[PDB]
Write a protein that holds these residues in place. Structure first.
Motif, PDB file in Angstrom:
ATOM      1  N   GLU A 199      15.366  -5.069  17.556  1.00  0.00           N
ATOM      2  CA  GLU A 199      16.639  -5.427  18.158  1.00  0.00           C
ATOM      3  C   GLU A 199      16.459  -6.642  19.067  1.00  0.00           C
ATOM      4  O   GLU A 199      15.431  -6.766  19.737  1.00  0.00           O
ATOM      5  CB  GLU A 199      17.201  -4.257  18.959  1.00  0.00           C
ATOM      6  CG  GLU A 199      17.867  -3.185  18.110  1.00  0.00           C
ATOM      7  CD  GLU A 199      19.150  -3.665  17.463  1.00  0.00           C
ATOM      8  OE1 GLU A 199      19.599  -4.783  17.789  1.00  0.00           O
ATOM      9  OE2 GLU A 199      19.710  -2.929  16.624  1.00  0.00           O
ATOM     10  N   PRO A 200      17.433  -7.548  19.121  1.00  0.00           N
ATOM     11  CA  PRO A 200      17.248  -8.777  19.902  1.00  0.00           C
ATOM     12  C   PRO A 200      17.349  -8.518  21.397  1.00  0.00           C
ATOM     13  O   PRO A 200      17.740  -7.444  21.857  1.00  0.00           O
ATOM     14  CB  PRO A 200      18.385  -9.688  19.423  1.00  0.00           C
ATOM     15  CG  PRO A 200      18.983  -9.008  18.239  1.00  0.00           C
ATOM     16  CD  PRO A 200      18.721  -7.559  18.412  1.00  0.00           C
ATOM     17  N   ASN A 201      16.974  -9.535  22.165  1.00  0.00           N
ATOM     18  CA  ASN A 201      17.172  -9.481  23.603  1.00  0.00           C
ATOM     19  C   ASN A 201      18.665  -9.546  23.915  1.00  0.00           C
ATOM     20  O   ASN A 201      19.411 -10.248  23.227  1.00  0.00           O
ATOM     21  CB  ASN A 201      16.453 -10.636  24.296  1.00  0.00           C
ATOM     22  CG  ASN A 201      14.961 -10.436  24.366  1.00  0.00           C
ATOM     23  OD1 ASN A 201      14.485  -9.335  24.622  1.00  0.00           O
ATOM     24  ND2 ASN A 201      14.211 -11.504  24.139  1.00  0.00           N
ATOM     25  N   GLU A 244      22.208 -10.670  25.251  1.00  0.00           N
ATOM     26  CA  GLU A 244      22.741 -11.984  25.568  1.00  0.00           C
ATOM     27  C   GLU A 244      23.262 -12.021  26.998  1.00  0.00           C
ATOM     28  O   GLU A 244      23.752 -11.023  27.532  1.00  0.00           O
ATOM     29  CB  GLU A 244      23.857 -12.365  24.598  1.00  0.00           C
ATOM     30  CG  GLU A 244      23.417 -13.319  23.501  1.00  0.00           C
ATOM     31  CD  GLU A 244      23.019 -14.681  24.040  1.00  0.00           C
ATOM     32  OE1 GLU A 244      23.064 -14.870  25.273  1.00  0.00           O
ATOM     33  OE2 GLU A 244      22.660 -15.565  23.234  1.00  0.00           O
ATOM     34  N   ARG A 278      14.154  -4.733  11.473  1.00  0.00           N
ATOM     35  CA  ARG A 278      13.823  -5.795  12.401  1.00  0.00           C
ATOM     36  C   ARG A 278      14.017  -5.313  13.838  1.00  0.00           C
ATOM     37  O   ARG A 278      14.881  -4.475  14.108  1.00  0.00           O
ATOM     38  CB  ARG A 278      14.687  -7.026  12.150  1.00  0.00           C
ATOM     39  CG  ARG A 278      14.163  -7.939  11.055  1.00  0.00           C
ATOM     40  CD  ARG A 278      14.082  -7.217   9.729  1.00  0.00           C
ATOM     41  NE  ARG A 278      13.735  -8.110   8.630  1.00  0.00           N
ATOM     42  CZ  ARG A 278      12.495  -8.393   8.254  1.00  0.00           C
ATOM     43  NH1 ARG A 278      11.449  -7.899   8.892  1.00  0.00           N
ATOM     44  NH2 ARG A 278      12.303  -9.190   7.208  1.00  0.00           N
ATOM     45  N   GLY A 294      13.385 -14.845  17.361  1.00  0.00           N
ATOM     46  CA  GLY A 294      14.302 -14.676  18.472  1.00  0.00           C
ATOM     47  C   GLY A 294      13.840 -13.758  19.578  1.00  0.00           C
ATOM     48  O   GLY A 294      14.135 -14.008  20.747  1.00  0.00           O
ATOM     49  N   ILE A 295      13.119 -12.690  19.237  1.00  0.00           N
ATOM     50  CA  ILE A 295      12.698 -11.743  20.256  1.00  0.00           C
ATOM     51  C   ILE A 295      11.749 -12.388  21.254  1.00  0.00           C
ATOM     52  O   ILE A 295      11.663 -11.937  22.399  1.00  0.00           O
ATOM     53  CB  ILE A 295      12.062 -10.499  19.607  1.00  0.00           C
ATOM     54  CG1 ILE A 295      10.766 -10.858  18.892  1.00  0.00           C
ATOM     55  CG2 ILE A 295      13.024  -9.878  18.626  1.00  0.00           C
ATOM     56  CD1 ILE A 295      10.064  -9.670  18.302  1.00  0.00           C
TER      57      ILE A 295
END
Ligand SMILES: CCCCCCCCCCCCCCCCCC(=O)OC[C@H](COP(=O)([O-])OCC(O)COP(=O)([O-])OC[C@@H](COC(=O)CCCCCCCCCCCCCCCCC)OC(=O)CCCCCCCCCCCCCCCCC)OC(=O)CCCCCCCCCCCCCCCCC
Ligand SMILES: CCCCCCCCCCCCCCCCCC(=O)OC[C@H](COP(=O)([O-])OCC(O)COP(=O)([O-])OC[C@@H](COC(=O)CCCCCCCCCCCCCCCCC)OC(=O)CCCCCCCCCCCCCCCCC)OC(=O)CCCCCCCCCCCCCCCCC
Ligand SMILES: CCCCCCCCCCCCCCCCCC(=O)OC[C@H](COP(=O)([O-])OCC(O)COP(=O)([O-])OC[C@@H](COC(=O)CCCCCCCCCCCCCCCCC)OC(=O)CCCCCCCCCCCCCCCCC)OC(=O)CCCCCCCCCCCCCCCCC
Ligand SMILES: CCCCCCCCCCCCCCCCCC(=O)OC[C@H](COP(=O)([O-])OCC[N+](C)(C)C)OC(=O)CCCCCCCCCCCCCCCCC
Ligand SMILES: CCCCCCCCCCCCCCCCCC(=O)OC[C@H](COP(=O)(O)OCCN)OC(=O)CCCCCCCCCCCCCCCCC
Ligand SMILES: CCCCCCCCCCCCCCCCCC(=O)OC[C@H](COP(=O)(O)OCCN)OC(=O)CCCCCCCCCCCCCCCCC
Ligand SMILES: CCCCCCCCCCCCCCCCCC(=O)OC[C@H](COP(=O)(O)OCCN)OC(=O)CCCCCCCCCCCCCCCCC
Ligand SMILES: CCCCCCCCCCCCCCCCCC(=O)OC[C@H](COP(=O)(O)OCCN)OC(=O)CCCCCCCCCCCCCCCCC
Ligand SMILES: CCCCCCCCCCCC(=O)OC[C@H](COP(=O)(O)OCC[N+](C)(C)C)OC(=O)CCCCCCCCCCC
Lengths: 347, 175, 96, 83, 98, 115, 171, 88, 99, 51
Positions: free
Chosen positions: G148-150, G152, G146, I45-46
């Motif tokens: 990587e998220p933004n 925080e 997946r 979420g992205i």
């Protein structure tokens, strides 16, 4: 119409609008539009005269046609994405259909021909619901799909509305068609800045609603639906003539009045994106709007038109109409410019 | 042949739409929308949904009956028109037929027609699922879900229908 | 009277559904070998129909993933008998 | 107490069909709340095995899950048979 | 998109073009609105049925419900149109903006 | 298939009888025989003149009610759900509103034919 | 995007069960209790692997118990059984309720000869646990990593510097 | 646009043209001043039919009291003028 | 939603029907359940701008499972080649396919 | 701005109500006899019906 039926019908119009605003499913959004259209027609035909029938007939045909296009876009989006969410569309062809559909419901040119007509054939109160509350739902869907809206399509409609809106109103003497064309021109400013900054679309829509509502309320107070009829107000309610002057000047975008704020903030956003030519064209083209607002002041407040002998009988009676929220709306529609930075609350 | 039943029914489906779109007298226009309603019920039926196919046909049969009773009242004249009695109705009727014919010609020969969307003429049967369902009709389960799952849909639909009755009573009261 | 008989009928249905459940594992096993046998036969023949095409990788997938994807009717019955296909596609819908 | 039996007796002598309608409709909306067998109705629906009962992987700490369909563990339809 | 989708989308356009081009009768243009509903119904039913979108199987049913709330509404105005003029000709609805 | 054959047979049989009806008998056609029948005297005006519908408001209501069967016919399948408390509430809610629709039109002289 | 790997026709060949559907329906309740383990082990493989090619080996063992299941009936209860399923086959819905007499003769023979006990109502619907040495598959969906998220946003809030900073407004 | 105005010369052509179509008046000796009865020989009813054509020509109702005096084409042109106020 | 009241009040009004991988009656899966699940889990979420580029594979696979265009083209090519070879007596049908 | 076209346009009614139109629709006329089961053979009952 039984007073109970009027409220329930009104509550259905708001429910139709509110369903579109809180929905996260393309099916409910369509249901919201259908429910709104179902309960708006009776308010047009609350008097049962031939002009109300024509207006309702023309209004029903235009919105129902628009709904078919909006449902067609929803189905194509389902095929190409397999989901119903109220978000960016997943096909260029569906976005064109939805954009035209919404443009038909708003009245943006070239799908504008009905707006002058429906308003003229319905009471002043009905016109107020048609030109203020009926933009909330079509606007709340553009606010959620603007990323996928084609750039050239949306801006073209806005440039056409500001032109068609400005020229159309030059030739009108009926107050219900001056406000009909004023609505079309203002739709152009709302949808021109949507691609760049949707927050300024809300601000232009909120100021438009207040100024429009204030105009209709003062028309209803004296029961005036023509230019000449509005010319006798200086002989009945002189305080009402000045308020019309201030509101009309504001609607023209003149500083330091509230109606300058939405235009002022729209120009900023477009320029920050290196769009210099379009705001300049929009700003100059809006002088057409200011001109036919100035004729109303000349015939209404800045000069004293001929009166009639029977006018003396009206001096002896008070103004018995509700004029709800009018004192508050008039202030908000002229003296909000110093509080411009408050627009951040809209985000 | 038989493998192309759905395509043949859809051709007849369009021919009915060209029928009443030409706008002859609504008596014949209502006939066209009944023929297309029937074959349209067939196409959905061949895709598995028999309840849906019968429902739309049933609902349109009732609706087109009310239109008929209205046509004899508000939409009639001394010489009702047919598809042959006007050049506008005739010109439009032949226009829509040719435009359907040229689509059937190119799709059945080229096997690939692109007009806004890309269409494939191999045959509708090539996309059907292979496995079986359980001991139930999948579409029947979903329609039953309207009450256990669709609580919000029932409320708005029920409310809208109730107002629909109220609304038409106001509009048609007159005076 | 109507309620007792209906109640008896719910118990009969369970006895009917359980019998199905006892058989499904065997039918699943049979169905798997039947599909794989047919996918290979389609693959084997394609090798003899695209043996000369320059730009063609025999038996190549169309998806990026390597997961198993259930074949559609067109793939499974590519060139089977004409009447075999008709009953495979519309056999259940037309059976009355 | 004297006007309740005057409205009812007036309608019963003018709208007998409407009285039978509201009376029948009332029992439909009331009796399900008061019935004691309504719970069984919902339980029989859950007992109809439409799907396949996919088994579980035995991690070694599932004493409430049976090892065979003919084991004491697991829900029983004994209440159904006697119903 | 299989060859069936071409005909259903072709049918929708025919109804759409029929609606926008009025002849004389208002009832003739009301059928085209009902015709468009039938196209959308079928097209949704094929899409939903084909992909086994089970819960979506109720969408076409809900669609018909508001398909008829327009027809009922549309016929209501037609009654009021013919009362004023005696016929449902669209050329009599020319009082506004003229 | 089997359904199609039955449909094709029933209508073919009817068509043959219609063909036989028009081609078997001896015919004798002239103007006065084929004129419209209005009890022996010539009709005054075409049968295509408008025919008033005194139950137009009842006809429109039929459309709205005729939809309820679409939403009500799933009930036999709906009763099989495990969430009977919700399904029972909505089934009665849907039917109750239909009755309220009827009772509103009834009291408002809606079901009364005009004159 | 690569070639689809399929088994050879030799890898899909097994002694098949060639008894009509009426025979299986009449003998499903005893089959659902005797051959529970070899095929409950199969269905778990089938659901977890989500791939027909990864549970072929378990599939063959399903036919094995199924075949050996019928050989037992063919060697003890051959005649009473053939009477049983013949009656079921007669009906178009293959209704159990119309053959309860012949069921008793078949239940008593298996019970006496083989000791088989029919499952009680609601038994075969249960959810059971099966012990398997097959490892639990990892990433059965063959999913990539997946994104990587933004990052925080952290830190206590502070008032905006110098205010709105809108043109000339000082607040 | 606004239609061309009615002029006394325009009316004159209409009257004579209408009279020209009439099959009892001889076109040779039909002058703008000729008399219906004495010159053209028309009888009373013949005169009544002409006046009916004029009503169709200009689309307005002529009372019987007035038509009793329209005994030559000239006064017809005068009468039409008086109704449409065509002083010209 | 313009006004995300449902999130505020925690009441599911229409999100149960938005996607086809949601919970269905009797756990009936859709044909493209596996692909819709992966695209949604890749792109959670992205944000939409990133998911337009980083989860592009999982969305093209999904779009294939829906309309099957890349699959029908392949079958179309084989059918074209086959009918050509069988037109000049060069293709011998295999037994099962016909007999 | 009057033009060639809009010369003939008239101001709308003060109250928005236009005058009702003249005789529009006639009742259907029907011969209820003489060859009718209920006409006693010799009754030509000419009726004007509204529906
Ligand atoms: C931005 C913020 C500013 C927003 C400005 C809002 C104020 C609008 C101007 C008010 C005009 C006025 O004074 O009323 C005269 C005018 C009276 O008209 P009339 O022709 O003389 O007689 C009306 C009936 O025939 C008479 O029927 P009847 O005699 O049989 O009795 C029925 C009764 C019925 O009484 C009611 O009005 C019921 C109240 C319904 C509102 C419920 C609020 C939510 C709960 O009649 C009335 O209408 C009462 C007089 C009107 C008072 C309205 C006060 C509430 C308006 C402000 C709330 C706006 C909410 C949106 C309105 C609905 C949108 C479709 O009232 C109206 O008809 C206008 C209604 C408001 C429509 C505009 C809504 C603004 C949309 C923007 C909202 C932004 C958010
Ligand atoms: C959130 C908290 C906001 C608190 C607002 C409290 C005031 C609202 C209630 C006032 C009221 O009853 O009539 C409103 C309103 C009456 O409309 P109106 O024509 O503006 O009333 C003027 C009369 O002088 C009305 O006065 P009156 O002569 O008929 O009788 C005296 C009236 C006294 O009522 C008044 O003082 C009317 C003026 C109150 C202010 C109304 C505008 C709402 C203020 C909030 C909006 C501020 C603008 C946003 C700020 C922008 C700057 C950033 O007494 C009351 O109504 C007692 C109200 C307490 C219950 O009622 C409705 O329309 C239906 C709701
Ligand atoms: C209003 C705008 C100007 C209108 C003129 C026309 C211009 C039109 C074009 C518009 C151009 C854009 C907007 C203007 C430029 C502002 C740009 C900016 O940076 O804003 C900074 C501005 C001030 O920031 P600052 O420079 O850091 O601090 C200013 C001083 O240090 C002082 O701040 P402070 O915190 O140290 O002390 C506060 C001072 C107040 O501040 C000031 O007055 C002077 C500060 C003005 C800043 C310079 C702006 C230039 C314009 C001068 C306006 C003259 C105001 C005085 C008018 C005479 C009244 C004494 O004294 C107080 O009043 C005590 C606090 C009172 C609290 C009230 C509590 C609730 C009760 C309210 C009752 C309402 C009265 C009921 C009536 C009953 C009668 C019986 O903040 C704002 O954004 C507010 C903008 C609006 C200005 C309001 C000032 C007057 C407020 C009282 C209303 C009196 C009527 C005003 C005339 C309106 C007639 C139509
Ligand atoms: C070829 C044209 C010449 C064929 C000869 C001919 O005209 O005979 C047709 C004949 C002649 O046409 P006709 O109109 O004179 O026959 C009508 C029936 N009679 C003669 C008894 C009054 O028509 C027929 O087709 C025969 C009618 C009976 C068929 C009924 C079964 C239909 C199935
Ligand atoms: C791609 C195909 C493009 C569409 C071509 C279809 C042509 C349809 C016209 C059919 C013939 C026709 O309608 O008549 C010519 C038409 C004028 O209409 P018409 O009713 O004939 O008026 C005079 C007689 N009363 O003339 C027209 O109005 C032509 C309008 C197009
Ligand atoms: C002839 C012809 O092909 O004209 C097609 C024209 C241009 O569209 P297009 O072919 O996509 O442009 C080239 C892209 N390579 O496109 C057209 O003119 C087609 C016009 C279609 C009408 C659009 C109205 C909205 C209806 C949307 C539903 C989908 C309609 C398309 C499918 C119907 C035809 C099968
Ligand atoms: C938890 C939810 C369950 C509750 C559901 C709530 C909805 C209930 C209504 C749904 C059905 C729609 C009908 C509603 C309208 C009631 C009927 C009505 O409006 O009658 C009005 C009637 C007008 O006719 P009128 O011209 O006045 O002639 C009589 C002269 N007095 O004038 C009258 O005569 C009115 C007289 C009073 C009407 C009383 C009606 C009582 C209805 C409830 C009866 C239930 C009791 C029976 C069941 C108990 C179990 C046995
Ligand atoms: C391939 C994908 C594209 C699919 C396109 C679908 C369109 C195919 C044609 C289907 C039929 C379309 C509906 C027919 C339109 C219609 O109803 O015509 C109405 C209009 C009536 O005019 P009227 O008042 O009767 O007098 C005529 C005097 N000229 O008629 C007229 O004014 C003149 C006659 C016009 C008839 C020709 C127009 C049909 C073609 C429109 C194509 C638009 C694109
Ligand atoms: C105005 C009329 C509309 C247009 C009709 C098309 C006519 C021209 C066809 C030529 C090309 C072609 O060969 O197309 C024929 C097609 C496909 O038929 P199929 O069974 O799949 O044939 C191919 C398969 N074989 C070889 C196994 C048989 O016909 C249709 O199914 C269209 C509908 C038929 C008309 C129904 C209405 C009466």
């Amino acid at each position: 119409m039984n007073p109970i039926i009027f409220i329930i019908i009104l509550l259905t119009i708001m429910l139709g609008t509110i369903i579109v605003m809180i929905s996260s499913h393309w099916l409910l959004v369509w249901i919201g539009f259908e429910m709104n259209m179902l309960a708006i027609i009776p308010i047009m035909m609350k008097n049962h005269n031939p002009r109300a029938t024509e207006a309702s007939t023309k209004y029903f045909l235009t919105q129902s046609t628009a709904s078919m296009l909006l449902m067609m876009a929803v189905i194509i989006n389902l095929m190409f994405s397999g989901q119903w969410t109220v978000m960016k569309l997943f096909n260029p062809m569906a976005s064109m259909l939805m954009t035209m559909a919404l443009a038909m419901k708003l009245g943006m040119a070239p799908f504008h021909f009905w707006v002058p007509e429906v308003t003229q054939g319905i009471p002043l109160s009905s016109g107020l619901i048609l030109l203020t509350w009926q933009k909330l739902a079509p606007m709340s869907v553009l606010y959620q799909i603007f990323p996928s809206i084609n750039l050239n399509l949306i801006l073209t409609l806005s440039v056409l509305s500001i032109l068609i809106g400005g020229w159309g109103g030059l030739n009108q003497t009926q107050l219900r068609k001056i406000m009909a064309y004023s609505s079309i021109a203002h739709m152009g400013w709302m949808t021109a800045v949507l691609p760049y900054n949707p927050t300024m679309t809300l601000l232009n829509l909120i100021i438009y609603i207040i100024m429009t509502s204030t105009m209709f309320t003062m028309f209803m107070a004296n029961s005036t639906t023509t230019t000449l009829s509005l010319s006798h107000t200086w002989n009945k309610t002189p305080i009402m003539t000045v308020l019309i002057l201030a509101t009309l000047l504001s609607m023209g975008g003149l500083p330091p009045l509230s109606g300058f704020m939405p235009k002022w903030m729209i120009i900023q956003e477009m320029t920050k994106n290196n769009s210099i030519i379009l705001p300049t064209f929009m700003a100059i083209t809006a002088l057409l709007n200011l001109y036919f607002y100035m004729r109303l002041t000349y015939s209404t407040t800045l000069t004293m038109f001929p009166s009639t002998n029977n006018m003396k009988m009206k001096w002896q009676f008070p103004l018995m109409k509700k004029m709800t929220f009018l004192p508050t709306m008039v202030v908000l529609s002229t003296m909000m410019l110093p509080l411009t930075p408050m627009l951040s609350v809209l985000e | 042949m038989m493998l192309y039943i759905v395509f043949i029914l859809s051709v007849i489906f369009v021919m009915g739409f060209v029928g009443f779109s030409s706008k002859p007298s609504p008596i014949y226009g209502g006939l066209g929308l009944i023929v297309s309603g029937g074959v349209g019920c067939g196409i959905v039926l061949n895709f598995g949904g028999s309840f849906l196919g019968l429902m739309v046909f049933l609902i349109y049969l009732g609706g087109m009956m009310v239109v008929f009773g209205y046509t004899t009242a508000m939409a009639t004249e001394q010489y009702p028109e047919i598809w042959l009695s006007n050049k506008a109705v005739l010109g439009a009727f032949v226009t829509g037929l040719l435009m359907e014919f040229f689509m059937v010609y190119y799709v059945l020969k080229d096997k690939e027609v692109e007009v806004v969307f890309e269409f494939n003429g191999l045959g509708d049967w090539v996309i059907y699922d292979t496995g079986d369902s359980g001991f139930f009709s999948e579409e029947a389960m979903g329609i039953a879900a309207l009450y256990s799952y669709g609580t919000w849909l029932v409320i708005v639909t029920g409310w809208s229908l109730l107002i629909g009755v109220v609304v038409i009573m106001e509009i048609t009261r007159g005076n | 009277s109507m309620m007792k008989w209906n109640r008896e009928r719910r118990r009969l249905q369970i006895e009917d559904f359980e019998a199905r459940i006892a058989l499904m594992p065997l039918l699943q096993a049979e169905k798997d070998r039947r599909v794989l046998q047919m996918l290979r036969e389609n693959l084997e023949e394609e090798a003899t129909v695209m043996k000369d095409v320059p730009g063609w990788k025999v038996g190549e997938s169309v998806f990026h993933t390597t997961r198993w994807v259930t074949p559609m009717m067109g793939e499974l019955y590519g060139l089977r008998a004409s009447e075999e296909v008709l009953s495979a596609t519309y056999g259940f819908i037309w059976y009355t | 107490a004297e006007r309740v039996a005057a409205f009812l007796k007036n309608v019963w002598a003018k709208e007998p069909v409407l009285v039978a309608s509201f009376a029948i409709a009332g029992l439909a909306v009331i009796l399900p709340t008061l019935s004691p067998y309504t719970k069984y109705s919902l339980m029989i629906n859950r007992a109809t095995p439409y799907n396949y009962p996919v088994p579980l992987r035995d991690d070694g700490n599932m004493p409430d899950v049976p090892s065979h369909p003919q084991d004491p563990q697991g829900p029983s339809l004994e209440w159904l048979k006697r119903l | 998109m299989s060859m069936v989708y071409m005909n259903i989308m072709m049918a929708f356009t025919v109804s759409l073009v029929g609606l926008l081009m009025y002849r004389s009768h208002l009832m003739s243009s009301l059928l085209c609105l009902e015709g468009m509903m039938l196209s959308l119904f079928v097209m949704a039913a094929l899409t939903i049925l084909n992909s086994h979108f089970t819960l979506a199987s109720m969408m076409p049913i809900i669609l018909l419900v508001f398909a008829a709330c327009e027809a009922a509404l549309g016929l209501s105005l037609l009654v009021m149109v013919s009362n004023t003029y005696g016929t449902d000709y669209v050329q009599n609805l020319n009082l506004l903006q003229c | 298939m089997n359904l199609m054959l039955a449909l094709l047979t029933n209508f073919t049989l009817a068509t043959l009888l219609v063909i036989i009806a028009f081609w078997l008998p001896q015919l004798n056609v002239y103007s006065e025989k084929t004129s419209p029948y209005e009890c022996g005297f010539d009709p005054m005006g075409s049968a295509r003149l408008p025919f008033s519908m005194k139950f137009f408001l009842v006809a429109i209501t039929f459309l709205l009610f005729d939809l309820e069967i679409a939403l009500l016919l799933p009930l036999p399948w709906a009763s099989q759900t495990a969430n009977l408390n919700t399904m029972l509430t909505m089934a009665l809610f849907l039917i109750i509103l239909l009755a309220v629709s009827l009772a509103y039109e009834w009291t408002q002289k809606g079901l009364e034919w005009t004159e | 995007p690569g070639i689809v790997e399929l088994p050879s026709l030799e890898d899909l060949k097994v002694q098949e069960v060639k008894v009509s559907s009426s025979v299986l329906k009449a003998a499903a309740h005893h089959y659902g209790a005797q051959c529970d383990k070899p095929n409950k082990e199969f269905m778990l493989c089938r659901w977890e692997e989500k791939d027909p090619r990864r549970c072929l080996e378990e599939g063959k063992l399903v036919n094995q118990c199924a075949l050996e299941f019928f050989r037992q009936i063919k060697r003890h209860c051959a005649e009473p059984f053939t009477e049983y399923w013949t009656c079921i086959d007669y009906s178009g819905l293959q209704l159990f309720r119309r053959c309860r007499k012949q069921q008793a003769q078949f239940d008593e023979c298996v019970l006496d000869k083989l000791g088989w006990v029919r499952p009680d109502l609601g038994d075969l619907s249960k959810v059971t646990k099966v012990k398997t040495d097959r490892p639990l598959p990892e990433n059965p969906y063959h999913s990539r990593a997946r994104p990587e998220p933004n990052p925080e946003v952290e830190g206590d809030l502070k008032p905006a510097r110098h205010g709105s900073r809108l043109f000339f407004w000082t607040m | 646009s606004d239609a061309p105005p009615l002029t006394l010369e325009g009316i004159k052509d209409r009257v004579l043209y209408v009279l020209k179509l009439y099959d009892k008046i001889d076109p040779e000796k039909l002058s703008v001043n000729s008399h219906f009865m004495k010159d053209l020989g028309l009888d009373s009813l013949d005169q009544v039919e002409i006046i009916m054509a004029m009503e169709d020509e200009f689309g307005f109702e002529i009372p019987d009291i007035d038509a009793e005096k329209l005994m030559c084409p000239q006064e017809i042109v005068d009468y039409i003028a008086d109704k449409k106020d065509v002083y010209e | 939603p313009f006004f995300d009241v449902q999130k505020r009040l925690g009441v599911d009004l229409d999100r149960w029907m938005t996607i086809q991988s949601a919970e269905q009656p009797h756990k009936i899966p859709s044909r493209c359940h596996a692909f819709e699940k992966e695209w949604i889990e890749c792109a959670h979420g992205i944000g939409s701008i990133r998911a337009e580029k980083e989860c592009k594979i999982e969305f093209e696979d999904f779009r294939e499972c829906l309309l099957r265009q890349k699959t029908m083209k392949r079958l179309h090519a084989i059918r074209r080649q086959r009918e050509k070879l069988i037109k000049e007596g060069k293709y011998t049908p295999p037994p099962h396919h016909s007999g | 701005y009057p033009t060639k076209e809009t010369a003939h346009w008239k101001p709308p009614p003060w109250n928005d109500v236009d005058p009702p139109k003249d005789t529009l629709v006639s009742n259907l006329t029907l011969n209820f006899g003489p060859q009718h089961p209920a006409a006693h053979g010799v009754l030509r009952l000419v009726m004007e019906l509204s529906g």
